[PDB]
Amino acid sequence: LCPFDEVFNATRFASVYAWNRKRISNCVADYSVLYNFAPFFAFKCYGVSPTKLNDLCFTNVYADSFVIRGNEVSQIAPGQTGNIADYNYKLPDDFTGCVIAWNSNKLDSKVGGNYNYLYRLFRKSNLKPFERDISTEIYQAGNKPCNGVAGFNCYFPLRSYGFRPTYGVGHQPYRVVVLSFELLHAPATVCGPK
Amino acid sequence: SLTEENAKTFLNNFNQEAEDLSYQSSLASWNYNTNITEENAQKMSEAAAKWSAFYEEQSKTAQSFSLQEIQTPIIKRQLQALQQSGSSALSADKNKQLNTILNTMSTIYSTGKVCNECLLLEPGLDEIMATSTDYNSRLWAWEGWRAEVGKQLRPLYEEYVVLKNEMARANNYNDYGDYWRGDYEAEGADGYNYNRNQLIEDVERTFAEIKPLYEHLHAYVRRKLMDTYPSYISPTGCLPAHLLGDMWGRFWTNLYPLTVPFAQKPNIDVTDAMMNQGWDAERIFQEAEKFFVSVGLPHMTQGFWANSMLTEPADGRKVVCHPTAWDLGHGDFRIKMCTKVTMDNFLTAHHEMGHIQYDMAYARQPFLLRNGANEGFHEAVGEIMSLSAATPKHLKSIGLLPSDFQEDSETEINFLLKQALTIVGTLPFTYMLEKWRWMVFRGEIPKEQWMKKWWEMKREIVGVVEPLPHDETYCDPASLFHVSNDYSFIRYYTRTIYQFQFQEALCQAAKYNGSLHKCDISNSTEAGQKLLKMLSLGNSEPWTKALENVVGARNMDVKPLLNYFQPLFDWLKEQNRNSFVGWNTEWSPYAD
Ligand SMILES: *[C@@H]1O[C@H](CO)[C@@H](O[C@@H]2O[C@H](CO)[C@@H](O)[C@H](O)[C@H]2NC(C)=O)[C@H](O)[C@H]1NC(C)=O
Ligand SMILES: *[C@@H]1O[C@H](CO)[C@@H](O)[C@H](O)[C@H]1NC(C)=O
Ligand SMILES: *[C@@H]1O[C@H](CO)[C@@H](O)[C@H](O)[C@H]1NC(C)=O
Ligand SMILES: [Zn+2]
């Protein structure tokens, strides 16, 4: 059995820019275990059908988990742009996989404030499909050469989330997992149930 | 390499930090309002100080981006909404002096007492001016108040005016009046451009059409008060300032028992009908939510029923006990209200929920644009809801009035009169006070003729005569809360105009055939999507375009106001035949 339980029922998820990636290979993939993790805010599969997932086999199933706001859940989709899928985690155009997303207010919200989840806001250029950036360099906005200090035309790229339970439904913490299937010429070792 | 993208990045960073700092400040303020303690007050003060420091630092940092290079309209508007400094333009010494003068005036107004009984402003004076009908019992209190508070605030107000003029000139303005009229300044296309100096030409123009109705109402009130005041009212004279149901005369609602068209048919009250059915605060809020959803507005958030304090706490918490609609941010909308099962609270619940529905509309706009079009717009969206929820047709649909009841003419006339005593009677006083403050700040009125010109305008605009002579030693304008404490007062006239404009625009869109005051926007999804077109813009567009999106006009219009009281206007014109509509500006109660 593939470790799908340790991806959706984890204890602490990573940030959006440092999205946690896990490779799933050499194991029977039971696609029926995805359910039972609460009514999902989103269960959108691109290029495949959520029903016939047990009727095929892929070489590798990459699982990318990250926490984002509620209004930014729609930005995790091929083609769409915004503030999340431009400098933190961009999806390929011809993406054949499944994006699941569910609220996690009870687990990832503190009364004082859960400032542990960070997100990149400023960057020189947009990212590429399946690219990670963990740099903490000052964003040189203007022509003034920044010297590691913050101020005018020198802003910090990584900001923090003010997750609190008093938020509404669009700013609460939402955990999003992305399962991307790979079909290289290598022999398939990840099949469904029997 | 262009400054446009740099300004965009700066605004993005400012909004990202403000959506957290202002949220923390609002949360601290709410925690203070929940349980008023010494620690919560300190936390709220620290949060407000941090927010103000951040805002002034960003404003000092934002002034390095002139609006001439910014081509994008929304970016230019966001930069303009932040470059405005305000009181920080003055030096440290002048700012400290102005703050000390403001605090001293606020302390004098809050700790004012009139004794020859010995009471204060709110406990005894308000009740006497509202309920008591004796001539001397009101005259002595009025004279004592306007002789103590006026003479104690005059020397401070004389320097306050100069300090405010200096602050205005320091912010590239001319006078304090022009600074207060800067909120109605719009920018955009050739038709969507409004100027500050253009407002003065409209507020007067809008006053000419409401003059005959106000004259008829004043004549009717005078004829009705002649009975209770036989030897103190002239048939062709003005009314004393202490016989208006209030210390200043802002609202004439206290004169309803003395000025009633038909006493044998009182107004409609649903208090007992609501108590019989066993309703409560949560039921009132659910009915208000159903009313707001029926017209076609978004649904309330789940946190509104959990984190908001809809009822009075029984855990011993001391609240201010007044209605307020708080928008903390990030989808946090709450209502703090001393809600009961009464009818006035039932209408206030629909009034305050309108502000919440407004705040839930422009949430998609940037933080520098999360506000109404002007000071007269935000308070105008919630007021029209009560006008539609307080109709005899809406009360029968909900279940407060039985189906066997029928609308009567005398009851409608009494209701229109009671509404005009509060809505129509406050417009001339507001206009006169604003004109006086504008002409004083502009230096047109010399400092040796403040009281003279004030009482001269009291006779020509409002038609109020003083019962005793008051020389320049007093300062009666400063006796008002909005004048003593720094606050704008022209917003009420614009609100009163815009509420009737919106009411007419939303009633003509639903194809309603009847009186304007008996409209009912319920069961009309077209009246919500048309209003949401303006509520979703907020401050991202000039107020002229926001007003055109609803009513079509790009300026104030008083014709909807005259159509609201048209039956009452005809009734007053028919009843005031055996009288002279108007007043001569020479009669004086103190003179023989
Ligand atoms: C009365 O006011 C006090 C403020 O001192 C409240 O105590 C706070 O309660 C909130 C919510 O539980 C928390 O911040 C802390 O537990 C308290 N803060 C501090 C600084 O002690 C108290 O909750 C209020 N009473 C009620 C019934 O709410
Ligand atoms: C997740 O794990 C916890 C503890 O192991 C368990 O109680 C819970 O039922 C799990 N969730 C699901 C959907 O099985
Ligand atoms: C308004 O709609 C409600 C439910 O949609 C209905 O019960 C009520 O009778 C309607 N009122 C009128 C006047 O049509
Ligand atoms: Zn209010």
Numbering used by the authors:
A (entry chain A): 335 to 528
B (entry chain D): 19 to 134, 140 to 615
Please give sentences taken from the publication describing this entry.
To our surprise, we found that mouse ACE2 bound to both Omicron BA.1 and BA.2 spike trimer with high affinity, but no binding to WT spike trimer. Moreover, mouse ACE2 binds to the Omicron BA.2 spike trimer with approximately threefold increased affinity (KD = 2.9 ± 0.2 nM) over the Omicron BA.1 spike trimer (KD = 9.1 ± 7.1 nM). To reveal the molecular basis for the high affinity binding of the Omicron BA.2 and BA.1 spike trimer to mouse ACE2, we determined their complex structures. The high affinity binding of mACE2 to both BA.2 and BA.1 spike trimers can be rationalized with the extensive interactions between mACE2 and the RBDs from both Omicron strains. Particularly, Q493R forms three hydrogen bonds with N31 and Q34, and a salt bridge with E35 of mACE2; Q498R forms a salt bridge with D38, and a hydrogen bond with Q42 of mACE2; while N501Y forms extensive π-π stacking interactions with H353 of mACE2. The interactions of the RBDs from both Omicron strains with mACE2 cannot be completely satisfied in the hypothetical model of the WT RBD-mACE2 complex, which are consistent with our binding assays that the WT RBD cannot bind to mACE2. Collectively, our results indicate that the three mutations of Q493R, Q498R, and N501Y in the Omicron RBDs are essential for mACE2 binding. We determined the structures of spike trimers from both BA.1 and BA.2 in complex with mouse ACE2, and our structures elucidated that the three residue mutations Q493R, Q498R, and N501Y are essential for mACE2 binding, suggesting their importance in infections.
The trimeric spike protein is a major membrane surface glycoprotein of SARS-CoV-2 that mediates the binding to the host receptor ACE2 and subsequent viral entry into cells. The matured spike protein contains two subunits: an ACE2-binding S1 subunit and a membrane-fusion S2 subunit. Extensive structures of the spike trimer reveal the open and closed conformations for the three RBDs within the spike trimer, where the open “up” RBD conformation is prerequisite for ACE2 binding. Upon ACE2 binding, the spike trimer undergoes conformational changes to expose the FP motif of the S2 subunit to initiate membrane fusion that allows the release of the viral genome into host cells.
